[PDB]
Each structure stands twice: as C-alpha cells, then as structure tokens.
C-alpha cells in the first residue's frame, strides 16, 4: 500500500524540412501493461486476451504464470491508439494501458543519413537528432499513482511534473530535391553497379544544403538488419583526393597570379611529363598543346602542372584554403571530416603539380559543393548550413569576381563545347562543371588501384545565373565505364534538370528545352 511515481513522455520535437514537411515526429502511440496478480484472479479472460494481443493462448498463460509474484510486466509496446483501446475495451482485470511516443521517419531512407535517429530511449544517436538532441528532446514529466497490497491501481492522485515538448527544428533540405537526388543516384548506382555514392546540392546564395543524400543508406524505422556501412553519410564522414575538379581552383590560382590569361597555350606533348621518378600522365593524348579552356576541356594534368610549377604551389594551396578545401564547415554534422590540405616548408615539384591536379589532398563532397558554390556565386564563399536561414547571410569574396567570370565561362565549355562533357548537359538550361576520375587508393599498401575508381562531377546551374551546386560522387562503378564524364555527367545532368524545374527557375537555354518548358 503505497504511491509509485511513473514518468510523462515528452513530445520530441518536430523535425521538418525548409517548407514544413515532417521529416522526424513522435506519434502517438500505446503500451499495455498488465499487473499479474489482478491477471491470476481473472484466468478465463486469458485466451479472448491472448487472441487479442496475436499470442499463443499456452505462451501467453506461461507468462503471465511465471510472473504471477510481479505486480508489473509488458503486454504489448507501441500499439495504435486505436488497438489498445480496443483491448481495454474488453475491460479484462489487471491490464492497463500507458500512451507513449514513437519516433516516425516519413520519408524513410530517402533522409536516413542527414536525419538520423533516436535509439530505445529516445535520444539521438545518428545524425540531426544527435546534433540537436538538446533542442529536440524535450522534458518529461511525473505523476503519482495510489497502489494497493496487491498491486492495482486505484488512483491517480497528482501529477508532480508537467512534460514539456521539445522544439521544432526546419533543416535546410529541400524533401522534393531530397526525393529526386535520392532516386536518382540510386539508378545511377544500380545502373553502374557502383558500391557506394553521395550526391549533395547547395543553393550557392544562401549557403543551404538542399540535398544530400548516399548510397547505401536504410530505413530508419525499420532497423532490423542494420549493416554499419549503409549508416554513413558519406557526403560529410568520408573523404576522397577531388583529382581534376580541383582544377578550376588551380586556374583560379593561375589567372590571379598575373602571370597567366585565357588565350595562353601551353604545351603539353605527348602528354607525359617526367619529372625525376615520378611522371604526370594525360588520358586524353590527343592534342600537343591547348589554350587555359582546352586544359579544363581535356582535363590536362599535365597543362595545370605546367601551370602550377609557373605560379607555384603556395598561389594553389590559398585559393583551396580560401574556398573552404580542408577547412572546417563549421556545420557540426556528428562524425564530420575536415579533409586534408597539405602544407609542407618546402614544395618538391611532384607535390606542387599532383596537388595542383588534385591529388595528395582530401576533401568531402559538401566540401567540394562549397567550394562551387563559391566560384558559382561569383567568388564569393557563404557559410554552409543545414538549418532553414532566413536572412542571406554576408559572404567572404574569396576569388574575384573577373576571375570567378572567366572560370565559369570555361567550365561551362567543358560541359558545351566540342569534345567536352556533354552526357552533363541540362535540357533547357546552361550548366557549367567539371568532371573527374579518380583511382581509388591501395586497400593495404600505399599507392594506387589498378582497376577501381571514383566518379566525380561537380557543377552548377544556370550558366546565366547560378543557382545551385551540385556535387556527384560514385564510387567502383563496374558495368558501364568509371569515367567521370560519363558514370556521374548524366547523373548531374538529371538532377539538375529536375531540381531547377522543381524550384521553378526560369530556363536559360530554351534551344533545348523540354516539353512544357517551350510554353511557358
Ligand atoms: C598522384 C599520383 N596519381 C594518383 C592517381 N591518378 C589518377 O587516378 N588519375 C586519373 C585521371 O587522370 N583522370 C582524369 C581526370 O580526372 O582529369 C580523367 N577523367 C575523365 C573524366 O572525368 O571523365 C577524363 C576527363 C576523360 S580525364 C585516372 C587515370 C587513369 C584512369 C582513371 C583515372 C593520377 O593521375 C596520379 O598521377
Ligand atoms: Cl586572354
């Protein structure tokens, strides 16, 4: 004969995306509990009950049986509001219900990686709801109830504590450009039997990720088979050397050193260039020199180290720090890389040009958006975020905005142009980007794969106005090439299309625009 105090669930907070659509709630949901002692008086209830709860009639006796000492125990956890009234409803002796809360994810895998989850207890494990699990969580409360000798309930007496809900939290996504960004790097990975992939897209004057999505990724709410691997969010936790979509950097470096302008051509025959034991290869040999443009069309490792070792590494190094390679996104994602920007005293030739090319450093993809972003935006650099901004936040002027001009007018020729990347042309629109291939690094030895490889391609859109970045990363594509151009060219060429539509920006390039876009 006594008062227990039992705990008031507290609503978890409302994760949506930038236009209110649910992303994480806590629904309402119930438990039944039973008090076996209450339950030993009424025994020819127990088979309708047993029916009721979908339990085999000799199972449910044992239990309640071999708990018959105990004045608690679980019948059921998480029942419809609706099925658990219904058992209440046969009004059986000992058997109570307690509503509580269950974290649901509409959209499922779909926002898996940037969502996350709570565990068993309700706090964040994964992703947004570990990083916001404070605002997110909320305070449940307490109340006293009166027990008899054997246990039953008779009174309710006093709530003690009141549960206060936790906050509603907009990210930045877009679900829609989520839904489609989601979908289709899925087909691309299937299409290309690829192992895993990211593919993130940044709105370049807000600094808002819309979109970031990987392959593999899970169902939130059904984690039975949960394997480690489909848990991460590559597009943040992973890193990767950007090889040569790195160079509109390099030539951001070129043209802002003086030294270097659009109409000079550097020769690169045969499209080898030793330097000590070490030698830069093109894969592209076809021409045996090329103005600034030719080498981002050709993608010239060789043109750009040629560069590089004019201008020097120290000019490259400062444009990639500048537009946020390496550097800290200050976005908090739980599990979230920095990258890598060497800095050695002394720059040796091989280091100067592998970096200038894009190896030796390591970015991630939302690294490589922003730094996009930046040249997208005219130079200038905003301040990543995952959260909805209502103001556009000020930027840093990290490339000129003559420089920034004339690197988009080239990277727009790598997608246009005669011998460039056209499987990453967007229906109606100009797009400007850059592809890229990288092999992938020795699993147990330095140096690297002989045959597995990166797909990249960054890019942004319209050419007239950008809008938004986009980054398309597929890792050990095997069934139709592994050529940056033309494993993540048409991925980007897709969801480009659809995104731009989707936020109803106007069309750039209606000499190839689509069926209703020539109406309106
Ligand atoms: C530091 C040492 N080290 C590390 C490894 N390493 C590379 O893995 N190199 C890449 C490479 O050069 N890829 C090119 C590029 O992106 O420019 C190609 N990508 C195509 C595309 O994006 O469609 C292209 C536009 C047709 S050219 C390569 C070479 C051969 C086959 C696949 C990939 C080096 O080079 C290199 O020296
Ligand atoms: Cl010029």
Same mark, same amino acid.
């Given at each position: 004969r006594?008062?227990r105090?039992?705990?008031?669930?507290a609503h978890?907070?409302?994760?949506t995306?930038?236009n209110g659509?649910?992303?994480?709630?806590?629904?309402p949901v119930?438990?039944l509990? *039973?008090n076996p002692?209450?339950?030993?008086?009424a025994?020819?209830r127990?088979?309708?009950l047993?029916?009721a709860?979908?339990q085999?009639?000799? !199972?449910?006796?044992?239990?309640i049986e071999?708990?018959?000492?105990r004045?608690?125990?679980?019948l059921?956890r998480?029942?419809?509001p609706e099925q658990?009234?219904? =058992?209440?409803? &046969?009004?059986?002796?000992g058997?109570?219900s307690?509503?509580?809360? @269950?974290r649901?994810?509409?959209?499922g895998?779909?926002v898996?990686?940037?969502?996350?989850?709570?565990? +068993?207890?309700?706090?964040? @494990?994964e992703?947004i709801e570990?990083?916001?699990?404070?605002?997110?969580?909320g #305070?449940?409360?307490?109340?006293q =109830?009166?027990?008899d000798?054997?246990?039953?309930?008779?009174?309710?007496?006093? +709530?003690?504590?009141?549960?206060?809900p936790?906050?509603? &939290?907009a990210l930045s /996504?877009? !679900?829609?450009?989520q839904?489609?960004?989601?979908?289709?790097?899925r087909?691309?990975?299937?299409?290309?039997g690829?192992?895993?992939?990211?593919?993130?897209?940044?709105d =370049?004057?807000?600094?808002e990720?819309?979109?970031?999505?990987?392959?593999?990724?899970?169902?939130?709410?059904?984690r039975?088979?949960?394997?480690?691997?489909?848990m @991460?969010?590559?597009?943040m936790?992973?890193?990767f050397?950007?090889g040569?979509?790195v160079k509109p950097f390099?030539?951001?470096?070129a043209l802002?050193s003086?030294?270097?302008?659009?109409?000079?051509?550097?020769? #690169?025959?045969?499209?080898? &260039?030793?330097?000590?034991?070490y030698?830069i290869?093109?894969?592209?040999r076809?021409?045996?020199?090329l103005?600034?443009?030719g /080498? !981002?069309?050709?993608?010239?490792?060789?043109?750009?180290?040629?560069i590089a070792?004019? /201008?020097?590494?120290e000019?490259? $190094?400062?444009?990639?720090?500048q537009?946020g390679l390496?550097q800290?996104?200050?976005?908090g994602?739980?599990g979230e890389?920095?990258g890598?920007?060497?800095?050695?005293?002394?720059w040796?030739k091989a280091?100067?040009?592998? &970096?200038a090319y894009? $190896?030796?450093?390591?970015?991630?993809?939302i690294?490589?958006?922003h730094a996009?972003? *930046?040249?997208?935006?005219?130079?200038?650099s905003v301040?990543?975020s995952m959260?909805? #901004?209502?103001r556009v936040?000020?930027?840093?002027?990290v490339?000129?905005?003559?420089?920034?001009?004339?690197?988009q007018?080239?990277?727009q020729? #790598? =997608?246009?142009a005669?011998?460039?990347?056209?499987?990453?042309?967007?229906?109606?629109?100009?797009?400007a980007?850059?592809?890229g291939?990288?092999?992938?690094?020795?699993?147990?030895t330095?140096? $690297?794969?002989?045959?597995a490889?990166?797909?990249?391609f960054?890019?942004f859109?319209?050419?007239?106005?950008?809008?938004?970045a986009?980054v398309? +990363?597929?890792?050990?594509?095997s069934?139709a090439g592994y050529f940056?151009?033309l494993?993540?060219?048409?991925?980007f060429?897709?969801?480009?299309?659809?995104?731009?539509?989707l936020?109803?920006?106007?069309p750039?390039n209606?000499?190839?625009?689509?069926e209703?876009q020539?109406?309106n």
């Open positions: 006594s008062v105090h039992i705990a008031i669930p978890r907070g409302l994760i995306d930038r659509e649910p992303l994480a709630v806590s629904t119930t438990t509990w *039973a002692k209450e339950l030993m008086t025994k020819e127990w088979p309708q047993a029916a709860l979908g085999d009639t000799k !199972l449910f006796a044992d239990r071999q708990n018959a000492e004045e608690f125990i679980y059921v998480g029942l419809t658990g009234e219904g =058992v209440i409803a &046969l009004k059986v002796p058997v109570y307690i509503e509580e809360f @269950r649901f994810y509409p959209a895998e779909v898996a990686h940037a969502v996350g989850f709570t565990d +068993v207890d309700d706090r964040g @494990r992703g570990l990083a916001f699990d404070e605002w997110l969580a #305070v449940p409360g307490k109340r =109830v009166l027990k000798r054997r246990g039953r309930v008779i009174k309710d007496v006093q +709530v003690t504590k009141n549960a206060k936790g906050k509603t &939290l /996504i877009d !679900l829609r450009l839904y489609l960004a989601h979908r289709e790097l087909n691309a990975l299937l299409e290309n690829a192992k895993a992939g990211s593919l993130v897209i940044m =370049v004057k807000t600094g990720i819309l979109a970031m999505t990987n392959q593999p990724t899970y169902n939130p709410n059904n039975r088979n949960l394997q480690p691997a489909a @991460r969010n590559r597009a936790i992973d890193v050397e950007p040569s979509t390099s030539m951001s470096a802002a003086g030294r270097w302008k659009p109409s000079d051509i550097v020769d #690169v025959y045969p499209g080898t &260039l030793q330097i000590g034991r030698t290869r093109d894969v592209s076809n021409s045996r020199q103005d600034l443009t /080498i !981002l069309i050709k993608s010239s490792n060789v043109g750009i180290s040629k070792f004019d /201008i020097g590494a000019s490259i $190094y400062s444009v990639m720090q537009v390496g800290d996104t200050g976005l994602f739980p890389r920095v890598n920007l060497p800095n050695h005293r002394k040796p280091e100067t040009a592998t &970096l894009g $190896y030796g450093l390591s970015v991630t993809a690294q490589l958006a996009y972003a *930046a040249l997208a935006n005219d130079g200038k301040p990543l959260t909805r #901004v209502d936040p000020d930027g840093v002027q490339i000129s905005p003559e420089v920034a001009s004339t690197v007018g080239m990277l020729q #790598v =997608v246009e005669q011998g460039g990347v056209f499987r990453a042309q967007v229906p109606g629109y100009h797009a980007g850059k592809s291939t990288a092999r992938k690094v020795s699993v147990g330095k140096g $690297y794969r002989e045959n490889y990166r797909s990249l960054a890019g859109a319209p050419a007239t106005d950008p809008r938004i986009m398309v +990363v597929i890792d050990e594509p069934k940056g151009g494993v993540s060219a048409p991925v060429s897709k969801v480009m299309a659809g995104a731009l539509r936020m109803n920006v106007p750039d209606l000499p190839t625009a689509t209703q020539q109406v």
